[PDB]
Amino acid sequence: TDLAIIWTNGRGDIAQDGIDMLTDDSLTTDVTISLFTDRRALDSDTLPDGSDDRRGWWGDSYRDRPIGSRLWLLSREKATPDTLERARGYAEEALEWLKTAGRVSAINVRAEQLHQGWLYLYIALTLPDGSVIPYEFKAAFNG
Amino acid sequence: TDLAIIWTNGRGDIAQDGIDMLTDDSLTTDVTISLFTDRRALDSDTLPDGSDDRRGWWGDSYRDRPIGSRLWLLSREKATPDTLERARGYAEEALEWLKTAGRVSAINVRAEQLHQGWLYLYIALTLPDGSVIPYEFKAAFNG
Amino acid sequence: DGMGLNIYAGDNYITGW
Amino acid sequence: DGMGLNIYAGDNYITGW
Amino acid sequence: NTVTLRADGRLFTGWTSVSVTRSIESVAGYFELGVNVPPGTDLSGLAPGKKFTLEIGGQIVCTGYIDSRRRQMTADSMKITVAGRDKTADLIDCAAVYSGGQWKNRTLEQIARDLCAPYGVTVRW
Amino acid sequence: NTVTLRADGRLFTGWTSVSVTRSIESVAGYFELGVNVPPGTDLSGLAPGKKFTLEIGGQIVCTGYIDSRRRQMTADSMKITVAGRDKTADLIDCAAVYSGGQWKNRTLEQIARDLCAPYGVTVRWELSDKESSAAFPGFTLDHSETVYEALVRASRARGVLMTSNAAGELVFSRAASTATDELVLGENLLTLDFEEDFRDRFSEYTVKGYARANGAEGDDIDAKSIVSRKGTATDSDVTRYRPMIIIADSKITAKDAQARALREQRRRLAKSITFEAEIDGWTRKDGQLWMPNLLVTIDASKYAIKTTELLVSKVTLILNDQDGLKTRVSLAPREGFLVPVESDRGGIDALVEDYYRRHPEKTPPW
Amino acid sequence: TGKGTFRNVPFLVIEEQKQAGGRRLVKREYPLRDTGGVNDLGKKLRSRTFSACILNSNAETARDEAGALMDALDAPGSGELVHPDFGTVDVMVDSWECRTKADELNYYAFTVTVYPSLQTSAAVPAQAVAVTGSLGDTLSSVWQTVKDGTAAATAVMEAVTGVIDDISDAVDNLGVTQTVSGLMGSLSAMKGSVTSLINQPAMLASSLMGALSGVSSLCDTRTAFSTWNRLAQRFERRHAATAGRQGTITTSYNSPVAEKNIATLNYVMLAAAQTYRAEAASQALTAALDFSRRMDNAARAPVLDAPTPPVFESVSDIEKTTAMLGAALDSVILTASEQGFSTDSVQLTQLRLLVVADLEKRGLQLAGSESHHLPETLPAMVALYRFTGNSRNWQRLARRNGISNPLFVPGGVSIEVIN
């Protein structure tokens, strides 16, 4: 039972609940951390920035697996199907480790362009029989 | 930081600067040496002269690599595309030893015929991120 | 090495002597 | 014959005795 | 049914080829395993002289010390093996040490227990 | 780089398959060549008993006498080979002949020079030690003993190792000192093989034997010390008990005991760890051929191997059609081919000896 | 134009041309498990092959060209191949054919396949041994005998006793941790028997070099550089003191042969100490690099655990040490150009070149060391994983640059990151 990543104003921070930080033991935290943390870009990949710096985590060489996803490569893109296909592939490769383990059964992800200027991903993970009912929420805005 | 080769009257030589000879630590001297020193011709090549001596260096059997370029085979050529193709190939072969190491990333060389009687060679390298700024000069004439 | 390993392993039945 | 030639050649490290 | 080699410090589970031998016409049972690792990794848990214990599934087959470790690599292949015998095989190639070379009136079990004392092997009758 | 076999009378240059062997763990170097000739021609110059000299390029590798010549032919193929060893191999299978079996007070070099006189082999002594030249208080010869057997017994007692030179001589060789070549995994290796077994290496070797009581020492040595002699050499690579007791080979003192016990320990060390490599060129980096007794620097770090320097122990040159030019070079640690006096890297005499031991090219005081 | 030449023999390209060759892989599949291992060993050769055709309407010039191309295809060695698809390259033949259909009166069709043609730190101890041997030979050769009762013998005896005293002080400083009783007794005997050694030159030099090697035999890789530096300073004091007084009315009283026998001994002792110091520095560099190599670089999950001198760690320290060694050895060579000339100088120059090259290459690692400009202060772990890809060697990044607290790597200064 770890802390929960609560999404407010486009970024996710921990929050209190009564006495201590609110807790959560489900796939929600695992998914929202494995999807929205920048992992190291490959040597051949091009970067959205004009710089030459690839993100990651100093502890990637201490945990047997790269931490997060490469969705930061699509920081600046125009509305073309190439970006949609690339986002689908990046999400699949980021969430594959769950299916490699036994914690999910199947993954089906689709990408679409909603109302002009909206990249939309629908990700469906098939939890097995013994999995606990996962957390569910909606990002909120304030101030 | 070796001596720099300065071109005057269509021939190159070292030069003085203040107290002693001017220095250079860049790719300019390496390129102007690897391109404009005659290396040994093969056994089957037809020399431009009517002679049968293949120019080279007595240190070619002491320096682990042939010294220069075979651009001297085109001393007397007419205006045909074959000479342009051969010059492009010879420059590529002369300068590929840089790309074999990590000193340049890519090489793009083209050959053309500018204003009548001109063999124009355009060689564009791609220095890596850490290479020092190369020297800069133009050929000069006097007297 | 079928016999070459039986020498390095024990042999309660002596090969010689 | 890998060993069968080491006998016909010398062996400054004795094999027996 | 996994073959685990309890080398000095940690477990080793996956193997490429296992060959274990046991017999009553012998004083030891030798084992030979084949390991495969990327070129450059450290193989120090499998070194000659380490104290090994082979455990097939949940049961122990052999226990003793590691004897040999071969590493080879050619233009198109790479092979690493490892060997070893029981701790009872320590007696086979080690010279017997006793103070008085003569036992006057002793039985075979007592002679064996007096001879296998310095090494560590336990005699069973 | 042509292999010319100077037989009796004339040269022979072209060959179909060549295999030459050399080592310091042996007293001879054997060769085997293949000859293809039209069926019916004469191959007399290549006959058993002829005096041969093998010459690779312009340098001589082996010299001696031809041993065997095989000729076979079937319904499809036909094959002729030829063999031979050094002239030092003339001692291996020939019984030693001397008038009086016993040598009273002689050194190993003098005994060898007296035993290898009738055949023609010349003895060469390279060690500059002060204890390897110690004379034998008495050395007898078992009747019907080969020169190889007698000299190997004496060399084992002294700790020295005997070997055959490249010119046919006998040599009491000295291990190399300076690292001359480099073998790395990434540049000049086609195949490596690193075997490291511990089925023979023990912890404490100890040798026991009988003291000297014949003649002059018989009026001095008491009864108990005649039988009570001992010597010990301990290894630090095996951490278990693992002892070994050796019954000596001849009359033995304490210093002699430790000498053989160490010789045994170092021979086991050499025989345990073995490196094997297949390089592409017969010639070395400088240009000469590959020969035994050379100290090379091993840089096989890509395969996680922590050895840094080794000594070549066996070199075999090959000229097969499927192989091309190859030479399979085998390596063993240098500390296995040393004399008990020297070591791998109490007075004025000790300091001077240390200086003249570090600098071998200098002339000792003697 | 579809024209290509082998050994400057022309042909016209025809139907087929191809190239092939990839990575050599070893593919092992582990039984009773899903996963398998795949490893790369080098790159396969390029097996480029092509087809060509030679036709001429003369029906005899075609035969001549076909024969010329046959002769140029079967020839020793490797020859250049010009091809529109491949370009100029050096290759060796493997096979060909000349299938003509006995109806096509002018047509000859070759097909060829071709392959490309095949094209310090370990040398310091040997040079140290050679330099020590040359110095010993020079000393014995130039040492001269003197009368027993004169003041020259007294001066020589005092100088030799002082040299032995310096070596003894070094051994006594060594002996705080170890047992040096045997070497101390040998040195005491040598000091006691000085008058015998003065008359015999070979024994004196041999014993002195043996004593130096005995001192070297007690020093670990930790204390070797420090002890040899102290000995070098001690001998440098004496050499400078005895060489600064060249011409004086009181120096005129001293005997000439005694002064020569003292100057040669002083120079030889100094040079030997400096050579051992340089060899010790190279060995310390080797030990430091082995310590760095000890650590792994592969991504491994952590597990619960239950069971070089400091002057050679930083980079500016290595620069200063290299400067000191170069200046000292250059001065020693300049001195050897006079007293004790010949190989002594030739050998010291070679040793200095080898040692300086070793220090410049391995100590500074100028090949794979980048210089970066941090925009803000970062921990060494982050600042190294950002530039290299592995945070395993985060200690070396904080140590080479001389940082005290590894967390606060200074922001706006150049950082030497090893890739």
PDB file of C-alpha atoms in Angstrom, chain B residues 12-132:
ATOM      1  CA  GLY B  12      51.225  25.025 -50.013  1.00  0.00           C
ATOM      2  CA  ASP B  13      53.910  25.508 -47.377  1.00  0.00           C
ATOM      3  CA  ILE B  14      54.357  26.360 -43.714  1.00  0.00           C
ATOM      4  CA  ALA B  15      54.436  29.999 -42.651  1.00  0.00           C
ATOM      5  CA  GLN B  16      55.781  32.248 -39.907  1.00  0.00           C
ATOM      6  CA  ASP B  17      53.694  34.152 -37.358  1.00  0.00           C
ATOM      7  CA  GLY B  18      55.372  36.574 -34.975  1.00  0.00           C
ATOM      8  CA  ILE B  19      58.130  34.627 -33.243  1.00  0.00           C
ATOM      9  CA  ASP B  20      57.766  31.135 -34.723  1.00  0.00           C
ATOM     10  CA  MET B  21      55.611  29.217 -37.196  1.00  0.00           C
ATOM     11  CA  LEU B  22      51.851  29.538 -36.896  1.00  0.00           C
ATOM     12  CA  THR B  23      50.123  26.561 -35.298  1.00  0.00           C
ATOM     13  CA  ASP B  24      46.883  24.705 -35.961  1.00  0.00           C
ATOM     14  CA  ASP B  25      44.965  22.066 -33.977  1.00  0.00           C
ATOM     15  CA  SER B  26      42.002  21.231 -36.211  1.00  0.00           C
ATOM     16  CA  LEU B  27      40.915  19.149 -39.203  1.00  0.00           C
ATOM     17  CA  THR B  28      42.172  21.651 -41.795  1.00  0.00           C
ATOM     18  CA  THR B  29      45.779  20.436 -41.870  1.00  0.00           C
ATOM     19  CA  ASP B  30      44.663  16.798 -41.807  1.00  0.00           C
ATOM     20  CA  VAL B  31      42.341  17.317 -44.786  1.00  0.00           C
ATOM     21  CA  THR B  32      44.801  19.412 -46.802  1.00  0.00           C
ATOM     22  CA  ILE B  33      47.443  16.717 -46.272  1.00  0.00           C
ATOM     23  CA  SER B  34      45.225  13.672 -46.879  1.00  0.00           C
ATOM     24  CA  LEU B  35      43.899  15.230 -50.106  1.00  0.00           C
ATOM     25  CA  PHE B  36      46.937  16.788 -51.813  1.00  0.00           C
ATOM     26  CA  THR B  37      49.809  14.322 -51.392  1.00  0.00           C
ATOM     27  CA  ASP B  38      50.235  11.636 -54.040  1.00  0.00           C
ATOM     28  CA  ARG B  39      49.917   8.071 -52.766  1.00  0.00           C
ATOM     29  CA  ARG B  40      51.239   5.011 -54.564  1.00  0.00           C
ATOM     30  CA  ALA B  41      49.316   4.057 -57.686  1.00  0.00           C
ATOM     31  CA  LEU B  42      48.182   0.474 -58.099  1.00  0.00           C
ATOM     32  CA  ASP B  43      49.928  -1.998 -60.382  1.00  0.00           C
ATOM     33  CA  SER B  44      47.187  -1.852 -63.032  1.00  0.00           C
ATOM     34  CA  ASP B  45      46.534   1.909 -63.091  1.00  0.00           C
ATOM     35  CA  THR B  46      47.470   3.887 -66.205  1.00  0.00           C
ATOM     36  CA  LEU B  47      49.513   6.925 -65.223  1.00  0.00           C
ATOM     37  CA  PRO B  48      48.667  10.283 -66.849  1.00  0.00           C
ATOM     38  CA  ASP B  49      52.318  10.666 -67.843  1.00  0.00           C
ATOM     39  CA  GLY B  50      54.115   8.603 -70.428  1.00  0.00           C
ATOM     40  CA  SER B  51      56.418   7.404 -67.626  1.00  0.00           C
ATOM     41  CA  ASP B  52      56.064   4.333 -65.336  1.00  0.00           C
ATOM     42  CA  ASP B  53      56.880   5.711 -61.830  1.00  0.00           C
ATOM     43  CA  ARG B  54      54.117   5.599 -59.148  1.00  0.00           C
ATOM     44  CA  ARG B  55      54.465   8.558 -56.711  1.00  0.00           C
ATOM     45  CA  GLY B  56      54.366   7.637 -52.977  1.00  0.00           C
ATOM     46  CA  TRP B  57      56.338   8.095 -49.755  1.00  0.00           C
ATOM     47  CA  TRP B  58      59.303   6.148 -48.406  1.00  0.00           C
ATOM     48  CA  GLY B  59      57.438   6.133 -45.087  1.00  0.00           C
ATOM     49  CA  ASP B  60      54.397   4.380 -46.567  1.00  0.00           C
ATOM     50  CA  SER B  61      56.010   1.140 -45.356  1.00  0.00           C
ATOM     51  CA  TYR B  62      56.533   2.756 -41.936  1.00  0.00           C
ATOM     52  CA  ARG B  63      53.226   4.507 -41.197  1.00  0.00           C
ATOM     53  CA  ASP B  64      50.567   1.723 -41.254  1.00  0.00           C
ATOM     54  CA  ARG B  65      48.507   3.539 -43.936  1.00  0.00           C
ATOM     55  CA  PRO B  66      49.130   5.067 -47.373  1.00  0.00           C
ATOM     56  CA  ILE B  67      49.644   8.777 -46.918  1.00  0.00           C
ATOM     57  CA  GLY B  68      47.545  10.698 -49.406  1.00  0.00           C
ATOM     58  CA  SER B  69      45.112  10.723 -52.316  1.00  0.00           C
ATOM     59  CA  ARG B  70      45.084   9.418 -55.882  1.00  0.00           C
ATOM     60  CA  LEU B  71      43.778  12.712 -57.293  1.00  0.00           C
ATOM     61  CA  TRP B  72      47.044  13.106 -59.234  1.00  0.00           C
ATOM     62  CA  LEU B  73      45.811  10.545 -61.786  1.00  0.00           C
ATOM     63  CA  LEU B  74      43.627  13.328 -63.258  1.00  0.00           C
ATOM     64  CA  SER B  75      46.385  15.781 -64.186  1.00  0.00           C
ATOM     65  CA  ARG B  76      45.366  15.885 -67.865  1.00  0.00           C
ATOM     66  CA  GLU B  77      41.682  15.117 -68.467  1.00  0.00           C
ATOM     67  CA  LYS B  78      39.043  16.379 -70.878  1.00  0.00           C
ATOM     68  CA  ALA B  79      35.513  17.529 -70.041  1.00  0.00           C
ATOM     69  CA  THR B  80      33.688  14.215 -69.692  1.00  0.00           C
ATOM     70  CA  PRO B  81      31.517  12.852 -66.854  1.00  0.00           C
ATOM     71  CA  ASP B  82      33.905   9.923 -66.341  1.00  0.00           C
ATOM     72  CA  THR B  83      36.579  12.226 -64.916  1.00  0.00           C
ATOM     73  CA  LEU B  84      34.054  13.814 -62.544  1.00  0.00           C
ATOM     74  CA  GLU B  85      32.920  10.398 -61.309  1.00  0.00           C
ATOM     75  CA  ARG B  86      36.523   9.267 -60.830  1.00  0.00           C
ATOM     76  CA  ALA B  87      37.411  12.435 -58.904  1.00  0.00           C
ATOM     77  CA  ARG B  88      34.408  11.947 -56.621  1.00  0.00           C
ATOM     78  CA  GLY B  89      35.419   8.344 -55.959  1.00  0.00           C
ATOM     79  CA  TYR B  90      39.064   9.237 -55.340  1.00  0.00           C
ATOM     80  CA  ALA B  91      38.168  11.967 -52.847  1.00  0.00           C
ATOM     81  CA  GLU B  92      35.793   9.580 -51.054  1.00  0.00           C
ATOM     82  CA  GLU B  93      38.514   6.926 -50.818  1.00  0.00           C
ATOM     83  CA  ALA B  94      41.105   9.460 -49.637  1.00  0.00           C
ATOM     84  CA  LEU B  95      38.909  10.895 -46.874  1.00  0.00           C
ATOM     85  CA  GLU B  96      37.141   7.707 -45.725  1.00  0.00           C
ATOM     86  CA  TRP B  97      39.876   7.088 -43.129  1.00  0.00           C
ATOM     87  CA  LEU B  98      38.334   9.909 -41.090  1.00  0.00           C
ATOM     88  CA  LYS B  99      34.872   8.323 -41.116  1.00  0.00           C
ATOM     89  CA  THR B 100      36.425   4.971 -40.187  1.00  0.00           C
ATOM     90  CA  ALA B 101      37.480   6.623 -36.923  1.00  0.00           C
ATOM     91  CA  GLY B 102      35.108   8.825 -34.940  1.00  0.00           C
ATOM     92  CA  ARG B 103      36.472  12.175 -36.104  1.00  0.00           C
ATOM     93  CA  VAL B 104      33.701  12.833 -38.665  1.00  0.00           C
ATOM     94  CA  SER B 105      30.124  11.566 -38.808  1.00  0.00           C
ATOM     95  CA  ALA B 106      29.347  11.724 -42.537  1.00  0.00           C
ATOM     96  CA  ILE B 107      30.932  12.892 -45.792  1.00  0.00           C
ATOM     97  CA  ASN B 108      29.150  14.281 -48.862  1.00  0.00           C
ATOM     98  CA  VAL B 109      31.313  15.043 -51.897  1.00  0.00           C
ATOM     99  CA  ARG B 110      30.142  16.085 -55.353  1.00  0.00           C
ATOM    100  CA  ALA B 111      32.006  16.903 -58.558  1.00  0.00           C
ATOM    101  CA  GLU B 112      30.958  19.458 -61.151  1.00  0.00           C
ATOM    102  CA  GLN B 113      32.197  21.498 -64.095  1.00  0.00           C
ATOM    103  CA  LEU B 114      31.883  25.210 -63.343  1.00  0.00           C
ATOM    104  CA  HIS B 115      33.022  27.978 -65.721  1.00  0.00           C
ATOM    105  CA  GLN B 116      34.783  26.252 -68.618  1.00  0.00           C
ATOM    106  CA  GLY B 117      37.983  24.535 -67.547  1.00  0.00           C
ATOM    107  CA  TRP B 118      37.123  24.146 -63.845  1.00  0.00           C
ATOM    108  CA  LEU B 119      36.998  20.859 -61.931  1.00  0.00           C
ATOM    109  CA  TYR B 120      34.862  21.837 -58.933  1.00  0.00           C
ATOM    110  CA  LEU B 121      34.878  19.537 -55.901  1.00  0.00           C
ATOM    111  CA  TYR B 122      32.438  20.258 -53.070  1.00  0.00           C
ATOM    112  CA  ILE B 123      33.273  18.245 -49.942  1.00  0.00           C
ATOM    113  CA  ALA B 124      31.037  18.682 -46.881  1.00  0.00           C
ATOM    114  CA  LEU B 125      31.873  16.816 -43.680  1.00  0.00           C
ATOM    115  CA  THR B 126      29.884  16.506 -40.452  1.00  0.00           C
ATOM    116  CA  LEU B 127      32.054  17.115 -37.399  1.00  0.00           C
ATOM    117  CA  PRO B 128      30.717  15.623 -34.139  1.00  0.00           C
ATOM    118  CA  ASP B 129      29.518  17.569 -31.109  1.00  0.00           C
ATOM    119  CA  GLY B 130      32.907  17.720 -29.374  1.00  0.00           C
ATOM    120  CA  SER B 131      35.269  18.555 -32.239  1.00  0.00           C
ATOM    121  CA  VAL B 132      37.185  21.827 -32.078  1.00  0.00           C
TER     122      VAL B 132
END
